[PDB]
Amino acid sequence: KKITANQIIGEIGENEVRGRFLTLGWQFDGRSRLEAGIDGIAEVMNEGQPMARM
Amino acid sequence: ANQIIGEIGENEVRGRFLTLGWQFDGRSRLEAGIDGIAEVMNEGQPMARM
Amino acid sequence: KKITANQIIGEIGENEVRGRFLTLGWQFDGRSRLEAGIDGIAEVMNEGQPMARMIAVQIKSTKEGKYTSESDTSFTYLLRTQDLAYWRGSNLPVIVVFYRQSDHSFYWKEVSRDAGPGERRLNIDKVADLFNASTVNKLAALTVPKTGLGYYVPPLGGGEDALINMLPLTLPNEMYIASTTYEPRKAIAVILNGDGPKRFDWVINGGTFWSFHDPRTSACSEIVDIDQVEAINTKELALHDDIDEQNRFSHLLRQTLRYQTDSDLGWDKDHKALYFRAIEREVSRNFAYTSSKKKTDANVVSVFKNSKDETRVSFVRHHAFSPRFELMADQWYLIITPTYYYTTNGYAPHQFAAPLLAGKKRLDKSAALRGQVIMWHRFLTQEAYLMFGEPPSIHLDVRVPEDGWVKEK
Amino acid sequence: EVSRDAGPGERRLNIDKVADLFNASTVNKLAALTGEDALI
Amino acid sequence: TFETRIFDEPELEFGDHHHHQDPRLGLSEAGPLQTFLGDVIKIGVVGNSKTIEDTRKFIETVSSGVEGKGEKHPNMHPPFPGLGNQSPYRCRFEIEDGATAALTKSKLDKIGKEPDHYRAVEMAVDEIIGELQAMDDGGSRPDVAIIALPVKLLERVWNAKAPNFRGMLKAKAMGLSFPIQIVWEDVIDDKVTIPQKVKESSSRKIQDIAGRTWNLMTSLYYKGSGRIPWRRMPLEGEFSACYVGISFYREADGQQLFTSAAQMFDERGRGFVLKGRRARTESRGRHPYMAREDAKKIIEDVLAAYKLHHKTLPARVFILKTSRFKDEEADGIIAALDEAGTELRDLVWVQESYTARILRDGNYPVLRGTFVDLHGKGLLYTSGSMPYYGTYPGKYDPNPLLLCPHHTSESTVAQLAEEIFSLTKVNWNSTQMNQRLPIPIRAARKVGEVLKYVGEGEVISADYRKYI
Amino acid sequence: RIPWRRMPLEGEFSACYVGISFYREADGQQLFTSAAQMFDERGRGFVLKGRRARTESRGRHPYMAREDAKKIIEDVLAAYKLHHKTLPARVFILKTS
Amino acid sequence: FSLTKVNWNSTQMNQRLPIPIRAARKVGEVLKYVGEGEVISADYRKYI
Amino acid sequence: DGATAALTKSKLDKIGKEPDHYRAVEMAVDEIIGELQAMDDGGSRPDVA
DNA sequence: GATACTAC
DNA sequence: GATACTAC
Ligand SMILES: [Mg+2]
Ligand SMILES: [Mg+2]
Ligand SMILES: [Mg+2]
């Protein structure tokens, strides 16, 4: 069961994008397995104030 | 505003784990105590050691 | 663009397994996209308190698929050799869960890695496992090491209703207190020598009949003047402060119960019990409850021959019980103490009876006691004044972890 | 690392730098456990 | 319906404030509560010329450590860690040479050829007491003595081929400087068996080699060192208390009944105090009930013993008795408490002969520590299916006990039941968890068996090591 | 609530602390006395109070009398028994004059 | 010497006087401006 | 947990035998007020008693 | 160019 | 022998 580096770099890129979204005061969330080539959803947030813009 | 810095710290710890590569996993909303469970991959061919 | 139903079925199965884990607590956690082998990690909770004990779980599901050798019990399944080794060099124990949507069925089984290679062929059953609230202690037993210096697991599962040995007694409307016709011991001899029906519904304490029945006929009014009848409310003596009235009412109740057997439940003296009587030499059966669960044969009287020859009789066993007639805060109660009795030629009191009683008391765990008290409640609850109630039920808070202990109590 | 092998526990972790950096330097160690005088 | 509760298993305080519920694991993990200042506990052996080397072989055998025979139940059968380095007592036991004595076969036959049953036991205890007293006044004084008995003796003192041997020897050894311990031959040598008086065509049985050693070494350490191994953990801010236990016994000449009492409390530092009294309390007839004056004197003595140590009077007094609190003996206690201004009081009768029981549908009985309020009384299950040993140790069904408070006690029955439940695993004689009776009742009963043979005008000590 | 307290030792006796000072009048020349009381709680706490009455005047010397010295001791001992249900084993008095 | 750092008015470590006399002086500082027949509180939070 | 006061049975027995009506009520309210005042001056002050 | 469903 | 996710 030898994994490849491809899944590693994909997970790393997703985590880094989530971290960059988090450090800007946004809200990013990933999807499941049945997703249709569509990754998670981001929400615009002010200083501790959600705006429900996705 | 401490929730955002806790989430940032957890994400950065997961990224540091994933950089060398150890298959870290987070937990749910009502977590109390242990924040995550990590594996040892050992340069591919992962082994169940948490 | 197009997605098959198989991944949908798998995702539904994983979600329902996660929900089944969550409905007992246990804080089930998901997994990333990089899974290989283990599908999830589950903690153990106790009423909201985490305990940091975790189990690895692999989830399998199906829709409309019939399992191999599907029957009531067999339920065989085949594993993979290459995946097993992944479960061999692991810290946490690994379990396998099977889910079916057609009958909404969950099952589980732990893979064994004791000393040798895996059997690769699971032979799970449906009576056990079944992934309900039961068998939750035997699942949680796979957290502690085999050495186990300390580190016990609290009794998961909450609440089970038990019962008590006590029986409420509803008293009749009236008694039949009468005039002074006292006799210390001849009061039993006059009815003993009489040709009328024999009754023991009376006691001589201060010159009174002390009867629940009408003293008009059936050989009851030959000792007392018939003109003296008294009955008002039974609110003067059964609910009265001093103790002499209480412990004479206890004897009145004991005599009333002693008369109302009519099965020749013979009264002994060394143990204060009613020790049955078989009319004919074989096993004498008794009450069957028939509560839509079982026929529940009683097999009360037992016959046992010698160790080598079936001709001579060794001993005959009967059931019995002892009453106490206790009380608190009105509503007099009855306490039942079950006991065994031994005879030799049917009608024989025996004289080496103590070792047999001790040896049988060494056996007969608490399930036999519960069954015997249920039998003795249902036997005599089928003329008047026998207004017995039901054994009161109390709801305990902690369930005894009987699941983690296999057998041979 | 929390010492999970002693008897009574011990608080007051003494975290020193360099030797306890969570980087590629320490990974196998992380995976190892699997009178004077005066006058008046 | 009825209101029911299930209490948790209480904790004990052993070692550096470390807490646990099993005495074995607590001692093996944190050591005793009060450590020995010295390093060596010296043991002397008195008996036959064959049992002395058996005792020595036992000591050097168990010094390295023995293993338990438990595979399915490992909490029930833990191994013995030894008597060195990894010791659970932080001390070493040594048999000093010159502190041992042997009984000649010339005089072990004269014991066996006496037609009367009385003088044989009398001369046996006189010989042992004389040897111990000769050992006392010299430079070979031990800390605790062992009286390991042969088999040929154990056909007259026990099998009688009729007074008691233990209750007379423990009464004649009250004036010595050290306690004594009695061991039979089977414990030290696992190749011999002893019959059981009547139906002699059998042999008595004992536990395995690892279960004996825990109790034996714990008792030896407590007897030799003098410091208690563990005590119950006190809770948070609570009023100071002094526990008194009262029981009765029968004199072994006739049918007269006597009374006994035991005191216990806490120390200003970290330590329990458990003791008796330096007096007897007469007979006053055959009844199992105490008078008024003796109860008042007992309460006064307990208060004085507390005030000598703490320099202040206590806040509450807790009294336990194996009898109903009559209306005459419940007034002397009130008067003696009101002469000192003690406010909170409690009086509880513990009854063991009760019939009511709780039944379950399974093959196992109820949990240990079940409480049901039966309209002002308490039904406590102090033995049951303990979920720490992994099973229910025993056969048939457990026996519960009833707690009945007096009408002048200011506490609900649930708090009193919990306090009684917390006072069970204080027995220093054994290291088992399934204990049924509270420590004050056990301590009041243990004094009486030794007080039975003391006599008139003799020395009575308040040390508990002369009775345990 | 109180932030910190002095750590007790092991084996001490129960004690209560009293402190006495003196102070002049508002504008005139008289001298009253003042007192404060202090002890330890049953659990994890501390008690530090003053009194509920004034101690009147007796002249211009910074010294108490035989009647004003008893009442402070009675109040201090009565405050302890309301909390610990028993008298203390030690009384500690501090003064400047 | 032990009863010096129990002053809740300050967080210093160089206190000179013990706590009871300091509390007595602090009470008497404000007890002199209370008129006759007025109320006196035993709470220490009204003096510190 | 610390803001709980229990009147002893001895005190309630003492106020059960005073044949003056006003006096017994006076001792009862004095006892309760003293307990409440001791609660007030301490560090376990509640919001409502 | 490797890992996850399920049916065959 | 059926449909999805990372990149080279
Ligand atoms: Mg799966
Ligand atoms: Mg002993
Ligand atoms: Mg200030």
Numbering used by the authors:
A (entry chain B): 3 to 56
B (entry chain J): 7 to 56
C (entry chain F): 3 to 384, 398 to 424
D (entry chain J): 112 to 145, 161 to 166
E (entry chain E): 2 to 162, 179 to 485
F (entry chain I): 244 to 340
G (entry chain I): 438 to 485
H (entry chain M): 98 to 146
The authors write:
D41 and Q60 coordinate a magnesium ion that points to the potential scissile phosphate group. Loading of substrate ssDNA causes minimal structural changes in DREN, with an RMSD (root-mean-square deviation) of 0.8. Secondly, DREN tetramer creates a positively charged and symmetrical pocket to accommodate two ssDNA molecules to form a pseudo-duplex, allowing formation of promiscuous base interactions (such as base stacking, wobble pairs or base pairs) between them. Although the sequence of substrate ssDNA is not palindromic, two ssDNA molecules still form a pseudo-duplex, and this symmetry-forced pseudo-duplex formation likely stabilizes both substrate ssDNA molecules to promote the collateral cleavage activity. Alanine substitution of the catalytic residue D41 abolished the collateral nuclease activity in vitro and the defense against invading DNA in vivo.
The short Argonaute-based bacterial defense system, SPARDA (Short Prokaryotic Argonaute and DNase/RNase-APAZ), utilizes guide RNA to target invading complementary DNA and exhibits collateral nuclease activity, leading to cell death or dormancy. In this study, we investigated the SPARDA system from Novosphingopyxis baekryungensis (NbaSPARDA) and discovered an unexpected filament configuration upon target DNA binding, which strongly correlated with collateral nuclease activity. Based on these structures, NbaAgo is divided into a MID domain (amino acid (aa) 12–50) and a PIWI domain (aa 250–485), while DREN-APAZ is divided into a DREN domain (aa 1–146), a bridging loop (aa 146–161), and an APAZ domain (aa 161–442). Collectively, these experimental results led to a detailed working model of NbaSPARDA that highlights the importance of the transition in assembly form during the activation process. gRNA loading, tDNA engagement, and guide–target heteroduplex propagation lead to the “monomer-dimer-monomer-filament” transition of SPARDA complex.
